[PDB]
Amino acid sequence: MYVKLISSDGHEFIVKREHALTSGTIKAMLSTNEVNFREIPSHVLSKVCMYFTYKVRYTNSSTEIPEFPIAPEIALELLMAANFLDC
Amino acid sequence: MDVFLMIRRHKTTIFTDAKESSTVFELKRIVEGILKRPPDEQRLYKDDQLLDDGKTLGECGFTSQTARPQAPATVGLAFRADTFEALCIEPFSSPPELPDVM
Amino acid sequence: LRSVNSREPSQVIFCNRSPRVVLPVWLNFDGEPQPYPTLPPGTGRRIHSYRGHLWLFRDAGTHDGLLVNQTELFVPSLNPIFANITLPVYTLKERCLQVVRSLVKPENYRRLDIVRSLYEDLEDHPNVQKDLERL
């Protein structure tokens, strides 16, 4: 049911398997239900996990969808992670 | 009504959701399924405030408006090993200086 | 991909369910995009259009794509018809590009420290002409 995504600084983020599989890249890494991200720090990976919860909730819902917030200080590294994980 | 949470202790962070009507104890049962630790060996906090088992997440102020999916509410987690550790949550890494451009 | 010339009137309401300034876009009878005045985020507007005409909606400042009744194109039918303009669930990559695009000037994209691929990705602004080609 859950998987563990570990940031470059050792923070362990635990999310549902279904959320984690929205990334094709993570699905590939998972086939321990753990994945180590040696280049994605904690302030990027936590935002990634927030996006999973946001994507799953607001895909197919028509209730008015809110902006996904990205602080300017986080955008460059979030872009690099999103680009690498294809999401 | 769904509330969206980060249950956080040390360098552990659980992303899960629950109902406003569900109870702190039921939240602890969810922690049990993941970290394999019984409720009586867990204390849950909203900030520094110790949360009582019978209270609903809504009464503890975890509401649809403040525990959103893109912006989850933090719930502190503390274990006991015959004494309970203090509540400790290690912060996330800090972003680098904003580049001259942004 | 153009508006039918039915000359059958159809009245619509442009409901902006988005935090963006919305730019409505009418595709005339030749397929050319026609820009209309903008809608502030929470605001409304009653519009006089015609059945079979073709409409799409974009962020008026960045041309980011928006939805209208959960699709990309809105066609007035027989009667007023409600056009609900929402944000899509953007990919994390594309939303990151929007935030980066809004923070640095296009001259200086090449001064940031990211991959080769990303600079081409940052340079490919959402473009109404481009999105139309997709057929």
From Swiss-Prot, chain A:
Molecular function GO labels = protein-macromolecule adaptor activity; transcription corepressor binding
Please state the protein's primary subcellular location: nucleus
Any one GO BP annotation for this protein: target-directed miRNA degradation
The residue range of the signal peptide is: none
Assigned keywords, A-Z? Host-virus interaction, Nucleus, Transcription, Transcription regulation, Ubl conjugation, Ubl conjugation pathway
Could you describe the subunit structure of this protein?
Heterotrimer of an A (ELOA, ELOA2 or ELOA3P), ELOB and ELOC subunit. The elongin BC complex interacts with EPOP; leading to recruit the elongin BC complex to Polycomb group (PcG) target genes, thereby restricting excessive activity of the PRC2/EED-EZH2 complex.
For this chain, the family text in UniProt reads: Belongs to the SKP1 family.
Name of the featured protein: Elongin-C
Organism per entry:
Homo sapiens (Human)
Full-protein residues shown: 17 to 111 of 112
Curated annotation (Swiss-Prot), chain B:
The protein's location, in the record's own words, is: Nucleus
Q: Does the keyword Ribonucleoprotein apply?
A: no
Q: Where is the Ubiquitin-like domain?
A: 1-66
Name positions with the PTM N-acetylmethionine: M1
Q: Name one Pfam family in it.
A: ubiquitin
The cysteines covalently paired via disulfide bonds are: none
- What are the GO MF terms of this UniProt record? transcription corepressor binding; ubiquitin protein ligase binding
The record's section on InterPro entries has: ELOB (IPR039049), Ubiquitin-like_dom (IPR000626), Ubiquitin-like_domsf (IPR029071)
Main subcellular location: nucleus
GO cellular-component terms in the record? Cul2-RING ubiquitin ligase complex; Cul5-RING ubiquitin ligase complex; cytosol; elongin complex; nucleoplasm; VCB complex
Q: Which residues carry this modification: Phosphothreonine?
A: T83
Its GO biological process annotations read:
positive regulation of proteasomal ubiquitin-dependent protein catabolic process; protein ubiquitination; protein-containing complex assembly; target-directed miRNA degradation; transcription elongation by RNA polymerase II; transcription initiation at RNA polymerase II promoter
The function of this protein is:
SIII, also known as elongin, is a general transcription elongation factor that increases the RNA polymerase II transcription elongation past template-encoded arresting sites. Subunit A is transcriptionally active and its transcription activity is strongly enhanced by binding to the dimeric complex of the SIII regulatory subunits B and C (elongin BC complex). Core component of multiple cullin-2 and cullin-5-RING E3 ubiquitin-protein ligase complexes (ECS complexes), which mediate the ubiquitination of target proteins. By binding to BC-box motifs it seems to link target recruitment subunits, like VHL and members of the SOCS box family, to Cullin/RBX1 modules that activate E2 ubiquitination enzymes. Component the von Hippel-Lindau ubiquitination complex CBC(VHL).
Quaternary state and interactors: Heterotrimer of an A (ELOA, ELOA2 or ELOA3P), ELOB and ELOC subunit. The elongin BC complex interacts with EPOP; leading to recruit the elongin BC complex to Polycomb group (PcG) target genes, thereby restricting excessive activity of the PRC2/EED-EZH2 complex.
Question: What family is this?
Answer: Belongs to the Elongin B family.
Q: What is this protein called?
A: Elongin-B
This chain is encoded by the gene named: ELOB
From Swiss-Prot, chain C:
Q: What is the effect of changing Y90D?
A: In VHLD; type I
Outcome, altering Q34P: In VHLD; type I
Q: What is known to happen upon mutating Y90C?
A: In PCC and VHLD; type I
The impact of changing C96W is: In VHLD; type I-II
Effect the entry attributes to changing I114V: In VHLD; type I
Effect after changing F14I: In VHLD; type I
Q: What is the effect of changing P24L?
A: In VHLD; type I
Q: Could you say what the effect of mutating S49C is?
A: In VHLD; type II
The UniProt-reported impact of L122P is: In VHLD; type I-II
| Effect on the protein upon substituting R95Q | In PCC and VHLD; type II
Q: Cite the effect that the entry attributes to L73F.
A: In hemangioblastoma
The effect annotated for N16S is: In VHLD; type I
Please give the residue ranges the record annotates as the region Interaction with Elongin BC complex. Answer: 91-100
Q: For the region Involved in binding to CCT complex, give the residue spans.
A: 38-89
- Describe what happens upon changing R45P: In VHLD; type I
* Effect of substituting G31S: In PCC and VHLD; type II
Q: In the UniProt annotation, what is the result of changing V68L? A: In ECYT2 and VHLD; type I
Task performed by this protein: Involved in the ubiquitination and subsequent proteasomal degradation via the von Hippel-Lindau ubiquitination complex. Seems to act as a target recruitment subunit in the E3 ubiquitin ligase complex and recruits hydroxylated hypoxia-inducible factor (HIF) under normoxic conditions. Involved in transcriptional repression through interaction with HIF1A, HIF1AN and histone deacetylases. Ubiquitinates, in an oxygen-responsive manner, ADRB2. Acts as a negative regulator of mTORC1 by promoting ubiquitination and degradation of RPTOR.
The protein, known as: von Hippel-Lindau disease tumor suppressor
**Gene name of the record:** VHL
Span within the entire protein? 63 to 201 of 213
